[PDB]
Amino acid sequence: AAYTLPQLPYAYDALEPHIDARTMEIHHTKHHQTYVDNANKALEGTEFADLPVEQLIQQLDRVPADKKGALRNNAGGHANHSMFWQIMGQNQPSGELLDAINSAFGSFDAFKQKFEDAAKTRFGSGWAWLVVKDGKLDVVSTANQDNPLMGEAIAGVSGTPILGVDVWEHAYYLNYQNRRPDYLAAFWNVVNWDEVSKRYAAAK
Amino acid sequence: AAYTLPQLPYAYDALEPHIDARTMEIHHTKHHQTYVDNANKALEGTEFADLPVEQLIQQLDRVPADKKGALRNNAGGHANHSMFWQIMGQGQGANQPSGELLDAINSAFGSFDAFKQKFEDAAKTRFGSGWAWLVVKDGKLDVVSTANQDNPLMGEAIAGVSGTPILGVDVWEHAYYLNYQNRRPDYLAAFWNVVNWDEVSKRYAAAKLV
Ligand SMILES: [Fe+3]
Ligand SMILES: [Fe+3]
Numbered sequence: 003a004a005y006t007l008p009q010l011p012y013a014y015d016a017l018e019p020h021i022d023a024r025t026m027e028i029h030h031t032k033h034h035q036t037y038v039d040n041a042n043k044a045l046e047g048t049e050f051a052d053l054p055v056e057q058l059i060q061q062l063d064r065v066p067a068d069k070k071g072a073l074r075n076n077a078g079g080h081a082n083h084s085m086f087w088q089i090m091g092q093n094q095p096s097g098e099l100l101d102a103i104n105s106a107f108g109s110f111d112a113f114k115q116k117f118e119d120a121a122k123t124r125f126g127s128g129w130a131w132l133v134v135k136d137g138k139l140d141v142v143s144t145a146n147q148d149n150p151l152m153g154e155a156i157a158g159v160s161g162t163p164i165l166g167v168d169v170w171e172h173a174y175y176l177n178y179q180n181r182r183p184d185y186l187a188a189f190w191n192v193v194n195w196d197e198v199s200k201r202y203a204a205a206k
Numbered sequence: 207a208a209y210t211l212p213q214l215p216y217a218y219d220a221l222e223p224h225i226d227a228r229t230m231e232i233h234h235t236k237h238h239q240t241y242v243d244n245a246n247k248a249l250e251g252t253e254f255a256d257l258p259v260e261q262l263i264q265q266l267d268r269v270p271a272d273k274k275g276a277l278r279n280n281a282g283g284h285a286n287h288s289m290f291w292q293i294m295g296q297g298q299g300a301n302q303p304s305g306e307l308l309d310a311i312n313s314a315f316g317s318f319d320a321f322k323q324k325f326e327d328a329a330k331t332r333f334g335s336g337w338a339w340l341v342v343k344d345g346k347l348d349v350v351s352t353a354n355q356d357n358p359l360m361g362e363a364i365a366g367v368s369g370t371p372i373l374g375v376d377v378w379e380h381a382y383y384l385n386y387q388n389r390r391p392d393y394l395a396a397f398w399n400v401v402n403w404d405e406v407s408k409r410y411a412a413a414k415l416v
Contacts, residue, residue: 032388075333125279126354126378127334146334170334171379172388180236180380 004051005038007031008084016092020188022177030087033172037079037147044072055081060151074156078147082129082166089165089201091194099199106139116141117167118186127170132198133161134205164201165193207246208255211239212288220296224396226385234291237380241283241355248276259285264359278364282355286337286374293373293409295402303403307410314347324349325375326394335378340406341369342413372409373401 010030015023045051050058050065050073058065058077065073094110095103107113113132121130124143131142133150142150142159150161167173167189174185214220214234219227249255254262254269254277262281269277302318303311315321321340329338332351339350341358350358350367362368375381375397382393 028387036388126336171383175379175383176387179232179384180240 004042004045005055005080007035007038008087010087012090012092017090017192019177020191021090025173025176028176029083029168029172034079034083037076037083040072041076041080044069044076055084056151059149060153062152062156074152075147078149078152081149081151082147082168085163085166086168089194089197090192091197093191093193093195095195095199097199099195099202102139102202107141113139113141114190117165118183121167121169121186122183124169129166129168131159131161131163132165133159133163134202135161137206162201162205164205165198207242208249209242209245209259209284211235211242212291214291216294216296221294221400224399225294225382229381229384232384233287233376233380238284238287241280241287244276245280245284248273248280259288260359263357264361266360266364278360279355282357282360285357285359286355286376289371289374290376293402293405294400295405296400298400298402301399301401301403303407305407307403307407310347310410315349321349322398326391329375329377329394330391332377337374337376339367339369339371340373341367341371342410343369345414370409370413372413373406 007030010026014026014030017026041055048066048069050061053061055077058073059081062070062074062077094100100110103110103113107116117130117132120141120143124130124145126145128143128145128148131144131150133140133142140161142161144150144157144159148157150157150159150163154160167186169182169186174182178185211234214230218230218234221230245259252269252273254265257265259281262277263285266274266278266281302308308318311318311321315324325338325340328349328351332338332353334353336351336353336356339352339358341348341350348369350369352358352365352367356365358365358367358369358371375394377390377394382390386393386396
């Protein structure tokens with residue numbers, strides 16, 4: 003009962019042809035639903051069912067030892083997907099965020115290449131992230147459903163994500179099959195930079 | 207180059223309807239090919255180019271530290287898929303083993319049906335990308351799983367498990383997504399129809415010879 007599946011900000015076909023509608027529906031109603039269901043099961047009987055998911059995943063070292071794995075995977079899955087839907091919409095940043103991107107990466111085009119590289123070289127399942135770390139932007143990747151908010155010890159990297167892309171094969175296989183780089187190029191067309199900017203201002 | 211893409215023992219549509227022809231083709235000519243190509247790149251400037259792949263993956267500590275990850279992933283990828291193609295077949299068998307292998311399964315797991323349950327459970331609980339395996343470990347059968355392209359031959363320190371694999375199923379989403387989408391359990395149930403138990407039994411007999 004802790005978490006519910008969030009509604010999408012747009013119809014399943016709103017991100018076409020960049021992301022197919024069938025993928026959106028399955029990704030949402032099956033994959034994301036499963037993380038919600040399994041996180042809920044894991045949270046029953048604990049003192050952690052009342053925390054927002056993004057706070058729970060920052061407290062994985064405090065949960066019961068036998069629940070840590072399940073919560074890392076499933077609360078991570080829920081946090082990651084919840085953000086993912088919101089940072090897309092039906093294309094460049096501006097204002098303070100663009101300035102930060104320019105400073106950290108040289109240019110928006112250079113940032114894109116770095117972000118794409120991190121996504122491409124992530125072997126197996128996982129995510130690539132733009133994070134705010136000590137007030138500065140960086141590009142990182144994580145395995146499976148790990149999130150940089152989980153911290154160094156668990157996720158391998160840290161910082162507050164403001165943008166992420168799902169590079170699990172489920173995110174792209176129906177439309178792109180093996181062609182992850184084509185998926186990643188097409189992703190830039192659906193990023194909601196207004197939402198990413200809101201998250202940057204917040205993280206700063 | 208050190209490695210080449212092996213030919214399949216059957217046509218791309220030979221495992222229909224259990225595994226779709228399109229998947230077989232892409233899995234073979236794109237995914238497996240990429241593992242071959244990238245392994246070949248990492249081996250180009252080394253003394254490891256002449257080893258059979260199954261020996262190379264057993265020697266990953268020996269390799270230069272800067273090549274270790276690349277070889278783990280890509281040599282592992284090549285070893286895994288090379289075995290995968292050989293342990294499936296068309297018009298097999300319900301499909302099940304017999305003889306010494308079946309006796310060993312009954313001994314280790316209680317029955318073939320119990321083994322299937324245990325193997326499906328290991329494959330289902332492998333979170334993210336990886337493989338489930340039937341291994342011979344100290345002369346006895348066990349069911350284990352690995353992450354990504356890790357293989358039990360790599361040893362416990364690298365792969366988290368050990369033993370000689372005699373059967374494995376690919377549970378990377380690319381192995382099943384076109385035909386089954388999220389339904390990994392449906393894929394796993396169909397997989398039993400294409401296992402070549404004659405080949406698995408050959409590998410068992412060899413593994414038990416010490
Ligand atoms: Fe996903
Ligand atoms: Fe594969």
